[PDB]
Design an enzyme around this catalytic site. Structure first.
Site, PDB file in Angstrom:
ATOM      1  N   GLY A  26      40.574  25.141  26.373  1.00  0.00           N
ATOM      2  CA  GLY A  26      39.327  24.473  25.995  1.00  0.00           C
ATOM      3  C   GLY A  26      39.536  22.961  26.046  1.00  0.00           C
ATOM      4  CG  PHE A  28      42.451  16.670  26.298  1.00  0.00           C
ATOM      5  CD1 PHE A  28      42.088  16.650  27.643  1.00  0.00           C
ATOM      6  CD2 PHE A  28      42.403  15.483  25.567  1.00  0.00           C
ATOM      7  CE1 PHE A  28      41.661  15.466  28.247  1.00  0.00           C
ATOM      8  CE2 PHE A  28      41.982  14.296  26.160  1.00  0.00           C
ATOM      9  CZ  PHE A  28      41.618  14.284  27.508  1.00  0.00           C
ATOM     10  CE  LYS A  46      39.584  22.594  20.869  1.00  0.00           C
ATOM     11  NZ  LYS A  46      38.202  22.262  20.364  1.00  0.00           N
ATOM     12  CD  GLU A  95      34.420  33.066  11.804  1.00  0.00           C
ATOM     13  OE1 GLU A  95      34.027  34.205  11.488  1.00  0.00           O
ATOM     14  OE2 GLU A  95      33.747  32.031  11.587  1.00  0.00           O
ATOM     15  CG  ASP A 140      28.926  20.346  24.442  1.00  0.00           C
ATOM     16  OD1 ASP A 140      30.172  20.487  24.475  1.00  0.00           O
ATOM     17  OD2 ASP A 140      28.231  20.521  25.454  1.00  0.00           O
ATOM     18  CE  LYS A 142      29.963  23.956  26.796  1.00  0.00           C
ATOM     19  NZ  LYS A 142      30.655  23.256  27.936  1.00  0.00           N
ATOM     20  CG  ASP A 158      33.735  22.239  21.818  1.00  0.00           C
ATOM     21  OD1 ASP A 158      34.002  21.148  21.255  1.00  0.00           O
ATOM     22  OD2 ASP A 158      34.083  22.457  22.985  1.00  0.00           O
TER      23      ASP A 158
HETATM   24  C1  R78 Z   1      39.763  28.198  19.996  1.00  0.00           C
HETATM   25  C2  R78 Z   1      38.704  27.456  20.854  1.00  0.00           C
HETATM   26  C3  R78 Z   1      37.297  28.116  21.008  1.00  0.00           C
HETATM   27  C4  R78 Z   1      36.810  28.095  19.615  1.00  0.00           C
HETATM   28  O1  R78 Z   1      36.479  26.979  19.139  1.00  0.00           O
HETATM   29  N1  R78 Z   1      36.763  29.212  18.879  1.00  0.00           N
HETATM   30  C5  R78 Z   1      36.328  29.210  17.467  1.00  0.00           C
HETATM   31  C6  R78 Z   1      37.135  30.471  19.437  1.00  0.00           C
HETATM   32  C7  R78 Z   1      37.104  31.607  18.662  1.00  0.00           C
HETATM   33  N2  R78 Z   1      37.401  32.791  19.229  1.00  0.00           N
HETATM   34  C8  R78 Z   1      37.786  32.888  20.516  1.00  0.00           C
HETATM   35  N3  R78 Z   1      38.054  34.122  20.973  1.00  0.00           N
HETATM   36  C9  R78 Z   1      38.454  34.498  22.226  1.00  0.00           C
HETATM   37  C10 R78 Z   1      38.356  33.699  23.362  1.00  0.00           C
HETATM   38  C11 R78 Z   1      38.821  34.183  24.604  1.00  0.00           C
HETATM   39  C12 R78 Z   1      39.330  35.488  24.655  1.00  0.00           C
HETATM   40  C13 R78 Z   1      39.863  36.115  25.918  1.00  0.00           C
HETATM   41  O2  R78 Z   1      39.854  37.341  26.005  1.00  0.00           O
HETATM   42  N4  R78 Z   1      40.376  35.344  26.858  1.00  0.00           N
HETATM   43  C14 R78 Z   1      40.922  35.963  28.065  1.00  0.00           C
HETATM   44  C15 R78 Z   1      42.397  35.573  28.093  1.00  0.00           C
HETATM   45  C16 R78 Z   1      43.043  35.759  29.474  1.00  0.00           C
HETATM   46  N5  R78 Z   1      42.231  35.179  30.565  1.00  0.00           N
HETATM   47  C17 R78 Z   1      42.795  35.572  31.869  1.00  0.00           C
HETATM   48  C18 R78 Z   1      40.857  35.716  30.526  1.00  0.00           C
HETATM   49  C19 R78 Z   1      40.200  35.289  29.216  1.00  0.00           C
HETATM   50  C20 R78 Z   1      39.398  36.281  23.518  1.00  0.00           C
HETATM   51  C21 R78 Z   1      38.971  35.789  22.296  1.00  0.00           C
HETATM   52  O3  R78 Z   1      39.046  36.539  21.135  1.00  0.00           O
HETATM   53  C22 R78 Z   1      39.737  37.796  21.019  1.00  0.00           C
HETATM   54  N6  R78 Z   1      37.835  31.801  21.291  1.00  0.00           N
HETATM   55  C23 R78 Z   1      37.501  30.594  20.768  1.00  0.00           C
HETATM   56  N7  R78 Z   1      37.569  29.456  21.573  1.00  0.00           N
HETATM   57  C24 R78 Z   1      37.946  29.693  22.985  1.00  0.00           C
HETATM   58  C25 R78 Z   1      39.408  29.879  23.372  1.00  0.00           C
HETATM   59  C26 R78 Z   1      39.438  29.432  24.825  1.00  0.00           C
HETATM   60  C27 R78 Z   1      38.140  28.730  25.187  1.00  0.00           C
HETATM   61  C28 R78 Z   1      37.333  28.648  23.899  1.00  0.00           C
END
Ligand code: R78
Ligand code: ZN
Length: 294
Positions: A26, A28, A46, A95, A140, A142, A158
């Site tokens: 996400g 940086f 993160k 979370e 933001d 979206k 975010d």
């Molecule tokens: C922490 C940053 C932002 C945020 O702020 N929160 C709160 C967040 C809360 N929960 C999640 N959850 C999940 C996000 C992605 C996945 C997932 O399955 N990703 C796959 C991994 C392998 N790849 C090849 C394909 C995608 C699973 C999640 O939960 C089980 N993501 C969050 N993100 C994201 C994290 C990356 C971008 C944004």
């Protein structure tokens, strides 16, 4: 090369987090499932390398995100559970939202049924109502930062572009970033406030009901032109009540738009079916909302 710790230790709180499954980048940040070694609870970590935060302006942006998000607590806002740092990384504990975001839903389902749209939009609006009443403009909103927990509840996340309104009538003149659903008053650099978030919800509603964003083109700059010129159209199959609300929210003049507190009183919500919950199947299969099972 600098490598991320496998165990993340917060020296102040004495909490340790074992780094688990990679979730994606996400900005940086590299993000991971992280679990508290004592309570076994799982969060979304993160992780931001300080090697990408060499400029005071970057640190100030990262600081402000943390400062705003740590101050918030609401059913429809991503839970902030801590942050800490070492000499090489900033660690933010959030979370975990196990059903990802509305972006992944949208890529799978495209246009949603109207009751699904009411359901999600209601929760986006409740979260934004909370933000605005605490004088925070998200800026933001979206599909990608509207996260979903296991129960398909929306969590606004975010806060990287968010800002706090410090005094009555303050117009922000600067937005250092590139939001997706950017309000025309931001683009024209004329001063903006809370109404930009209502513009974005407008765009989210269109996207949820139509299956594509209202101002899409093959060039971001052409998109901006269209936004400034208010050049969009609503397909004829969209119901007049929905289309009316989209139109209200997508007005060029920010003072013409409804404020966040007016939205749920719209005919779109009050005279239509809003499910109490969605079945997990709604992630892949359109619901019919049948009265009894056969
Ligand atoms: C922490 C940053 C932002 C945020 O702020 N929160 C709160 C967040 C809360 N929960 C999640 N959850 C999940 C996000 C992605 C996945 C997932 O399955 N990703 C796959 C991994 C392998 N790849 C090849 C394909 C995608 C699973 C999640 O939960 C089980 N993501 C969050 N993100 C994201 C994290 C990356 C971008 C944004
Ligand atoms: Zn800047």
């Amino acid at each position: 090369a600098k490598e991320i710790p496998e165990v993340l230790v917060d020296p102040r709180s004495r909490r340790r987090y074992v780094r688990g499954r990679f979730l994606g980048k996400g900005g940086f940040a590299k993000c991971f499932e992280i679990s508290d070694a004592d309570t076994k609870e799982v969060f979304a970590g993160k992780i931001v390398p300080k090697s990408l935060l060499l400029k005071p302006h970057q640190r100030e942006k990262m600081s402000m995100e943390i400062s705003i998000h740590r101050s918030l607590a609401h059913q429809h806002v991503v839970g902030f559970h801590g942050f800490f740092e070492d000499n090489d990384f900033v660690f933010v504990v959030l979370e975990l939202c196990r059903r990802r975001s509305l972006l992944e839903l949208h890529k799978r389902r495209k246009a949603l049924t109207e009751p699904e749209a009411r359901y999600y939009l209601r929760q986006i609006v409740l979260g934004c109502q909370y933000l605005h009443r605490n004088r925070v403009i998200h800026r933001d909103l979206k599909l990608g930062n509207l996260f979903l927990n296991e129960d398909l509840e929306v969590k606004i996340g975010d806060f990287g572009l968010a800002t706090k309104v410090e005094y009555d009538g303050e117009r922000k003149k600067v937005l250092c970033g590139t939001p997706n659903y950017i309000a025309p008053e931001v683009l024209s650099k004329k001063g903006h406030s809370f109404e930009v978030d209502v513009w974005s919800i407008g765009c989210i509603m269109y996207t949820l009901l139509v299956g594509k964003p209202p101002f899409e083109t093959s060039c971001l700059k052409e998109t901006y032109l269209r936004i400034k010129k208010n050049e969009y159209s609503i397909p004829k199959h969209i119901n007049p009540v929905a289309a009316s609300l989209i139109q209200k929210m997508l007005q060029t003049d920010p003072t013409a738009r409804p404020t966040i507190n007016e939205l749920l009183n719209d005919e779109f919500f009050t005279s239509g079916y809003i499910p109490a919950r969605l079945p997990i199947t709604c992630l892949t299969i359109p619901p019919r909302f049948s009265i009894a099972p056969s």
